[PDB]
Amino acid sequence: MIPGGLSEAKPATPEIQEIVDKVKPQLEEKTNETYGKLEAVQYKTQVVAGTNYYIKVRAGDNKYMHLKVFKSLPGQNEDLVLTGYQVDKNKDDELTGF
Amino acid sequence: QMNYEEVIKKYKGNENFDHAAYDWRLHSGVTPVKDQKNCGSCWAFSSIGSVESQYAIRKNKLITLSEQELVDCSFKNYGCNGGLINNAFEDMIELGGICTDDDYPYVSDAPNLCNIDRCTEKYGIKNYLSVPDNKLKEALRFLGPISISVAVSDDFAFYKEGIFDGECGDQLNHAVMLVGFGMKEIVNPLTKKGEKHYYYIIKNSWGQQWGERGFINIETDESGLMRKCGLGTDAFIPLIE
Ligand code: NA
Ligand code: NA
Ligand code: NA
Ligand code: NA
Ligand code: NA
Ligand code: NA
Ligand code: NA
């Protein structure tokens, strides 16, 4: 109910909405490992000047995390990168924000 | 802390209203569109935009204030990931002012700080105001544009030229500014009648060259409560006087 910001806990998507697993070429920068197609569980969204999604993932020791994978406008068309990674989390740590 | 109860006495209580068309973009009030990229600051953008308009109408000063200032110095507001439009005017009334877009920058999705000593220019308000869910056109003109909100969706963002007779978002999750109203003359594909297609000229805090320079106009009426996509709802306007 507040302008362009913190949403509510969103459950999950249908069979198609595959922003969850675009991690394979975009963790390569700093979160690179054998961690490919990381296991996301719950989702959320945000709005600024385009689309700003959120994904809660699992990675490593089945250790969970959050992902600021932010989409945007269609200058070309589709684009999204993790504008922040944090891998010290759990399922309880969900998708707080910021 | 102040409302409409005694603000139309100084403009249009004892007067008449063109219930059709008035773009405040065309009468020395609307300031250049500014972008926010990937860090939710729409609220802060509309705050500085409205104060820009107030100065621009009175002494006609094309000064532009900053938006990251109210992303780091947001006391009772949240920040660069959400925030309310009305409790930013109050933080602005107590602090003292916002620094110009040069004297203080915006870096979008990036950590930044706040100093209220990176300026020497006294830019502040004295009172703010709320406008009802219907007088968005009636109070757009003699009082000035209104920091409003709109239901953001992929439909709302289809940025072509036209009146937005389409669907909307599922929650009131984006702040914008109401900058005018108008009317268009189109015809029916059966009996070629000049369908009166009035609208609201609505700005976008995205600052993009979205459709009409960053101003998607949306289907509204001669009165002002049919407003789709929640065009209004949380409508706020500051006053330097
Ligand atoms: Na999608
Ligand atoms: Na282990
Ligand atoms: Na949980
Ligand atoms: Na009040
Ligand atoms: Na039609
Ligand atoms: Na109605
Ligand atoms: Na309301």
CATH of the domain at A68: 3.10.450.10
Q: For A2, which of B37, B84, B206 is closest by C-beta distance? A: B84
User: Which of A75-82's residues contact partners 24+ apart within 8 Å by CB, and which partners?
Assistant: A80/A19, A80/A22, A80/A26, A80/A53, A81/A26, A82/A23, A82/A26, A82/A27, A82/A31
Distance CA A74, CA A77 (A): 4
Beta strands in B66-174 (DSSP E): 127-130, 146-149
Amino acid at A58: R
Q: How far apart are CA A64 and CA B182, in angstroms?
A: 52
Token reading at B72: 């780091």
Secondary element (H or E) of residue B72: helix B69-72
User: What type of residue is B83?
Assistant: G
d(CA A95, CA B66): 29
| Cβ <8 Å between A4 and B208 | no
CA of B49 to the centre of ligand 6 (A): 29
Exposed e or buried b per residue across A82-96, where buried means at least 16 C-beta atoms within 10 angstroms of its C-beta: beebebebeeeebbe
Beta-carbon separation of B36 and A52 below 8 A: no
Which among A2, A7, A49 has CB closest to B35? A49
Please give, rounded to a whole number of angstroms, the shortest distance from the CA of B206 to a CA of chain A: 4
Q: What single DSSP character describes residue B67?
A: S
d(CA B18, CA B30): 20
Integer Cα distance of B181 and B202 in angstroms: 8
CATH number of the CATH domain containing B140: 3.90.70.10
For residue B132, what are its two tokens? 């009802």
How crowded is residue A28: how many other Cβ atoms within 10 Å of its Cβ?
A: 10
- Ligand showing the shortest atom-to-Cα distance for residue A91: 3
Q: Considering only CA atoms, which of B51, B39, B87, B31 is closest in space to residue B215?
A: B31
Q: How many CB atoms lie within 10 A of CB B88?
A: 26
Per the CB < 8 Å rule, is B82 touching A70? Answer: no
Q: Tell whether B158 is within 8 A of chain A (Cβ).
A: no
Nearest to B48 by CA among B28, B69, B27: B69
Element (H or E) spanning B7, and its range? Answer: none
Partner-chain contact B174 A3, CB within 8 Å: yes
Spatial separation of the C-alpha atoms in residues B140 and B231, rounded to whole Å: 13
Task: Give residue B201's domain range.
Answer: 2-239
Contacts of residue A7, Cβ cutoff 8 Å, sequence gap at least 6: A44, A45, A46, A54, B171, B173
Copy the structure tokens of residue B1.
């802390």
Q: How far is CA B119 from CA B69, B103, B116, in A?
A: 11, 6, 7
What is the rounded CA–CA span in Å between residue B109 and residue B2?
A: 34
Angle at which helices B42-58 and B86-95 cross, to 10°: 60
Resolution to 1 decimal place, in Å: 3.3
Dist CA B14 CA B11 (whole Å) = 8
Q: Nearest to residue B173, comparing CAs of A35, A8, A88, A32?
A: A8
With contact defined as beta carbons under 8 Å apart, do B74 and B88 qualify? Answer: yes
Phi, psi for residue B187 in degrees, rounded to 5: -130, 155
Chains A, B: CB contacts within 8 A come to 84
* Angle at CA of residue B51, ends B122 and B32, nearest 5°: 110
Q: Three-class SS of residue B142?
A: coil
* Whether B206 and A97 lie within 8 Å, measured CB to CB: no
| Exposed/middle/buried for residue A20 (C-beta within 10 Å: 0-12, 13-18, 19+) | buried
Question: Pick from B169, B176, B185, B189: which is nearest to B215 by CA?
Answer: B176
Contacts of residue A1 in chain B, CB cutoff 8 Å? 171-172
* CA-CA-CA-CA dihedral for B106, B107, B108, B114, to nearest 10: -60
Q: Which of B80, B173, B208 sits opposite A47 (nearest CB)?
A: B173
Question: Radius of gyration over alpha carbons of chain A, in Å?
Answer: 13
Q: Of B184, B197, B200, whose CA–CA distance to B137 is shortest? A: B200
Count of domains forming chain A? 1
Domain count, chain B: 1
